[PDB]
Amino acid sequence: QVQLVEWGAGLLKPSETLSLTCAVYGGSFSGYYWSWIRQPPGKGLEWIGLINHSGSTNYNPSLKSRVTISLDTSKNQFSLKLTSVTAADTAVYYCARGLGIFGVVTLSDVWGQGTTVTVSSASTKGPSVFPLAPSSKSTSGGTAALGCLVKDYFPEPVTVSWNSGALTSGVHTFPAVLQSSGLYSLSSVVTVPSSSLGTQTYICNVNHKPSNTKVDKKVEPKS
């Protein structure tokens, strides 16, 4: 049962160097290759550096100036070193098995579990609640969508309610989105009927436990 593990710090800062190492189970490195692979948020995997038992390496041309992979054959591991970490470096890092010849891996059977590395320097912040008003016109379908927009908070999570839960017809919460500056955003809307619009109260109550922010905002059809 060939097994692999990775480890390291889960939080890194900008302009810092990132250090990892993966451990092997049930084997050696003699003609057994190893790769360090990462999952950018919402994107596919990509690799940075490899090594074999002797110590020869191949590097990612884009991350060549920031990669250093070394083997520790006595205790049977291999280390990832990523200097000068930037916002583009957010990912979860995977070490994988490799069999091959002449530098190219011809076999990747098992994969590591992957360790989480966060690259941000954003402090905790309270959401800026933003009600959104629709066109307030009877569209093709008799549906009126009213809601509030949540932005600029850190970290997760936030849940948005409606009329203290009284309204449930058009309520649809969402997962959060990532602002590149280090804050997050969310969304909430209610799909109320067009006939029942204008006079009924539509209020969302936002919750951000990390920032202890509780804000009540009222949504209006038009002005």
Binding site: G42, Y94, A96, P131, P175
Partner: protein, 212 residues
């Protein structure tokens, strides 16, 4: 600068045979093997196509792959498309050993009729000008399959300043709701004359225009 790309989504009902593509950009995919990974949600990648035409032990032989050197594209083929095939499909190619991947492929089994999405757009409210902020709101829901792409416009011109698209989640009626948001500034809101949000659902896209 060799890179991999994968289609955003494909629609196909169970009982048919479906294909998944992955095309190189700068170089030739004939110079390295293609390896396909399947990623069921909440699971680590596992190989399905192996050395361009083989499969690992335990995977049914219906998972067939091929390499086309005419247009530098690779194909993932599933013959007996099953409801249990729902996963994330990735392709592999080597750029001097680079384990690069594409954008990802979401293949869904059709157990429901095709749904034409309805899109509602909300310009930044008046309470946002005093806060020195601005953001277009683009809400899409009630469509299946739930995988669309969004492109912002600024006076009928592409813009990617704050594209933040997150995955559609499950709804109450088994449908999905999209997400794509354009973060902006009050000076930029009044600077132009026409803002729109579009979603390319399958083959036809529906868009609306909002102006300040």
């Amino acid at each position: 600068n060799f890179m991999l790309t994968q289609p955003h989504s494909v629609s196909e009902s169970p009982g048919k045979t479906v294909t998944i593509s992955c095309t190189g950009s700068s170089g030739s995919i004939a110079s390295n093997y293609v390896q396909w990974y399947q990623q069921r949600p909440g699971s680590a990648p596992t190989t399905v196509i192996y050395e361009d035409n083989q499969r690992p032990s335990g995977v049914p032989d219906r998972f067939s792959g091929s390499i086309d050197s005419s247009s530098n594209s690779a194909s993932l083929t599933i013959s007996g498309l099953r409801t249990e095939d729902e996963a994330d499909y990735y392709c592999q190619s080597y750029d001097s050993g680079i384990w690069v991947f594409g954008g990802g492929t979401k293949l869904t089994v059709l157990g429901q009729p095709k749904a034409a999405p309805s899109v509602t757009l909300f310009p930044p409210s008046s309470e946002e000008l005093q806060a020195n902020k601005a953001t277009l709101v683009c809400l899409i829901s009630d469509f299946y399959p739930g995988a669309v792409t969004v492109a912002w416009k600024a006076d009928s011109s592409p813009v990617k300043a704050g594209v933040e698209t997150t995955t559609p989640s499950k709804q109450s009626n088994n449908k999905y709701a999209a997400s794509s948001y354009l973060s902006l500034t009050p000076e930029q809101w009044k600077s132009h004359r026409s803002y729109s949000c579009q979603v390319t659902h399958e083959g036809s896209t529906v868009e609306k225009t909002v102006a300040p």
